[PDB]
Amino acid sequence: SSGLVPRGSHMTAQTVTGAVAAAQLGATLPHEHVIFGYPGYAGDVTLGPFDHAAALASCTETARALLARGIQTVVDATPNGCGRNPAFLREVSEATGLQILCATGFYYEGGGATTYFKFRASLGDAESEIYEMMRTEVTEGIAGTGIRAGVIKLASSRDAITPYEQLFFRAAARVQRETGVPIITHTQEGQQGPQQAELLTSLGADPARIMIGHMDGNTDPAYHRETLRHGVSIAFDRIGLQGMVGTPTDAERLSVLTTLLGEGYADRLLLSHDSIWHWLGRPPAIPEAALPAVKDWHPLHISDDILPDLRRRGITEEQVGQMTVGNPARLFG
Question: Which residues form the interface with Co ion (CB under 5 A)?
Answer: 77, 186, 274
33 is in an annotated binding site: yes
Are 63 and 73 spatial neighbours (Cβ–Cβ below 8 Å)? no
Which residue among 127, 129, 304, 309 contacts a copy of itself (CB under 8 A)? Answer: 129
Of 77, 58, 76, 67, which Cα lies nearest the Cα of 98? 67
Q: Residue count at the site for a copy of itself (CB under 8 A)?
A: 44
Closest CB to Co ion belongs to which residue? 186
Contact between 326 and 28 (Cβ < 8 Å):
no
By C-beta, is 129 or 267 nearer to a copy of itself?
129
According to the annotation, is 301 in a ligand binding site? no
Which of a copy of itself, Co ion, none sits in contact with 274, Cβ below 5 to 8 A by type? Answer: Co ion
Note whether 150 binds a copy of itself by CB under 8 A. no
Residue 231 binding result from a copy of itself, Co ion, none, given CB thresholds of 5 to 8 Å by partner type: none
Please indicate if the annotation marks 153 as binding a ligand.
yes
274 among annotated binding-site residues: yes
Q: Which segment (93-101, 211-219, 220-228, 276-284) binds a copy of itself by CB under 8 A?
A: 276-284
Helix ranges, 31-180 (H): 52-68, 86-96, 115-123, 126-139, 163-179
- When the beta carbons of 168 and 236 are compared against a copy of itself, the nearer one is 168
Say if residue 214 carries a ligand binding annotation.
Answer: yes
Q: Determine the Cα–Cα distance for residues 218 and 193; give it in Å rounded to an integer.
A: 10
Closest CB to Co ion among residues 77, 147 = 77
Whether residue 274 contacts residue 32, with contact meaning beta carbons closer than 8 Å, is answered with yes
Q: Is 284 in the site for a copy of itself (CB under 8 A)?
A: yes
**CA–CA separation, 194 and 177 (whole Å):** 20
The minimum distance between CB 266 and a copy of itself, in angstroms, equals 36
**CB-based burial label for 276 (10 Å; 0-12, 13-18, 19+):** buried
6, 180, 193, 281: which one binds a copy of itself (CB under 8 A): 281
Among 18, 65, 96, 120, binds a copy of itself (CB under 8 A): 120
CA–CA dist 215, 196 (Å, integer): 11
Nearer to a copy of itself, 140 or 318 (CB): 140
291 binds a copy of itself (CB under 8 A): no
Determine the Cα–Cα distance for residues 63 and 86; give it in Å rounded to an integer: 16
Tell me the closest approach of the beta carbon of residue 50 to Co ion, in angstroms.
19
Read off the amino acid at residue 317. E
Distance, CA of 213 to CA of 270 (rounded, Å): 9
Residue from the set 114, 157, 233, 324 that interacts with a copy of itself by CB under 8 A: 114
Cite the beta strand spans of 167-275 per DSSP E: 183-186, 210-212, 233-236, 269-271
| Phi, psi at 179, each rounded to 5° | -125, -15
DSSP 322: I
Q: Does residue 160 contact residue 192 with C-beta atoms inside 8 Å?
A: yes
Q: Which is nearer to a copy of itself, 11 or 143 (CB)?
A: 143
Question: What residues does 56 pair with on adjacent strands?
Answer: none
Q: Decide whether 206 or 274 has the Cβ nearer to a copy of itself.
A: 274
Binding residue positions for Zn(2+) = 31, 33, 153, 186, 214, 274
Positions in the binding site for a copy of itself (CB under 8 A): 37-47, 49, 79-81, 84, 106, 111-117, 119-120, 123-124, 129, 132-133, 136-137, 141-144, 281-282, 284-287, 290
